[PDB]
């Protein structure tokens, strides 16, 4: 059993993303339309789905490997 414990160098207070719209669909009809949500420094939000729903590309557009076709994300 390894002993892993992620600490925190600095604590965030208000929120993280405040995402409004992405309009991200690679070639076919967008797998998601609006996706306007916040975090208020929340937790978890376990995205689920079947093999081919778009969780990883959503995460990539969220971090910055890719960017949404139209919209913005912006971190704290």
């Amino acid at each position: 059993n390894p002993f892993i414990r992620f600490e925190q160098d600095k604590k965030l207070f208000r929120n993280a993303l405040e995402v409004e719209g992405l309009t991200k669909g690679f070639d076919n009809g967008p797998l998601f339309k609006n996706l306007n949500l916040l975090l208020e420094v929340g937790e978890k939000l376990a995205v689920l789905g079947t093999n081919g729903v778009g969780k990883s590309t959503l995460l990539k557009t969220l971090v910055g490997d890719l960017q949404p076709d139209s919209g913005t994300v912006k971190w704290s």
Binding site: E43, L45, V47
Partner: protein
Amino acid sequence: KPNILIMDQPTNHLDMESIESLNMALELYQGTLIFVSHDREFVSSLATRILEITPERVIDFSGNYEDYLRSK
């Protein structure tokens, strides 16, 4: 030591004995995270703010995932 962990799929290759350590660390974590791990008793263990994606309708915060998977 980051504030927000994105952690696409952490339970991919783990030992099921490192899975327990990962769960302990995630529960003890006081920062922020998102993740899309498909494991059942991982989201059941920690998740509370489900963001269910689906080509036509997306679900945002049904609850603690148990109301979710008992309604559906």
